[PDB]
């Protein structure tokens, strides 16, 4: 991991960093 935070406000980084929506 090099940053740790997430994607858009409606998603989020997976394992692999991949924005996904949340649900």
Do not use: I, L
């Not at 991991?1 to 649900?23: H, I, S, V, W």
Request: glycine content about 14%; proline content about 4%.
């Amino acid at each position: 991991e090099n940053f740790a935070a997430g994607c858009a406000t409606g998603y989020q980084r997976t394992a692999d960093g991949r924005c996904k929506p949340t649900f």
